[PDB]
Amino acid sequence: QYEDGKQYTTLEKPVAGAPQVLEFFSFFCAHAYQFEEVLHISDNVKKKLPEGVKMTKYHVNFMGGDLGKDLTQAWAVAMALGVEDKVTVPLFEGVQKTQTIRSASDIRDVFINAGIKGEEYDAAWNSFVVKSLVAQQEKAAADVQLRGVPAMFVNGKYQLNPQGMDTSNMDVFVQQYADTVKYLSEK
């Protein structure tokens, strides 16, 4: 059932010092929105994860305009202030549903309506933690030669392959996907 080529695939050159479980997404990809607001794969997968398995998520720049670079940074601020699960939805809601985020300031605003003081935000926005957090997000996508989002990788060696799983029913699909990540999480 679990074969390198079906539920997943391996890297010819596995990245060292990689998050146990690394998800890659982009606010600018409407399919990357389903992944956690309809499929909540980030949740249903966090559920079946082994006690102690960090479910890290990194943002990647879409086109390359200043906005994408700000959202990557704005994302590093969330992982910084550990507010990931507070800004995720409004950011997604903000960028593509209400489509009110068109500047680094609007991003700032979304962070305030979530309970983040516009002061502690700037503090983080201009911090070296965030600078390093930005730096890593870019580094990792580079080390896995990312070719599309959303995408997930394990131990820096395995790349989940959704379209290689049973997709004739959402539960079958998400259950397999979660179980593949748990398994692939042992090797």
Nearest C-alpha neighbor of 76 from the set 59, 92, 91, 95: 59
Integer CA distances (angstroms), 165 to 4, 128, 168, 175, in order? 12, 40, 9, 10
Experimental method: X-ray
CA distance 127 to 135: 12
In the block, tokens 């990647």 appear at: 60
Our measurement of the distance from residue 157's CA atom to the centroid of its chain's CA atoms, rounded to an integer in Å, reads 17
In eight-state DSSP terms, residue 4 is B
In eight-state DSSP terms, residue 156 is T
Cβ within 8 Å of residue 180, ≥6 positions away: 2, 7, 8, 160, 165
Residue 77: phi and psi, rounded to 5, are -70, -35
Query: How many distinct helices (H) and strands (E) make up the chain?
Result: 8, 4
What CATH number is given to the structural domain containing 76?
3.40.30.10
Q: In sequence order, what E strands does 60-180 have?
A: 151-154, 158-159
Domain that holds residue 139: 1-187
Nearest C-alpha neighbor of 106 from the set 86, 121, 124: 121
Q: In sequence order, what E strands does 99-184 have?
A: 151-154, 158-159
Q: In terms of C-beta density within 10 A (0-12 exposed, 13-18 middle, 19 or more buried), how is residue 61 classed? A: buried
Domain count, the chain: 1
CA distance 110 to 46: 25
The structure tokens listed for 44 are: 């249903």
In the block, tokens 């966090």 appear at: 46
Nearest C-alpha neighbor of 85 from the set 137, 120, 46, 125: 46
In eight-state DSSP terms, residue 48 is T
Resolution (A): 2.7
| 71 contacts 95 by C-beta, under 8 angstroms | yes
Cβ within 8 Å of residue 7, ≥6 positions away: 160, 161, 164, 165, 176, 177, 180, 184
CA distance 100 to 22: 28
| 57 contacts 42 by C-beta, under 8 angstroms | yes
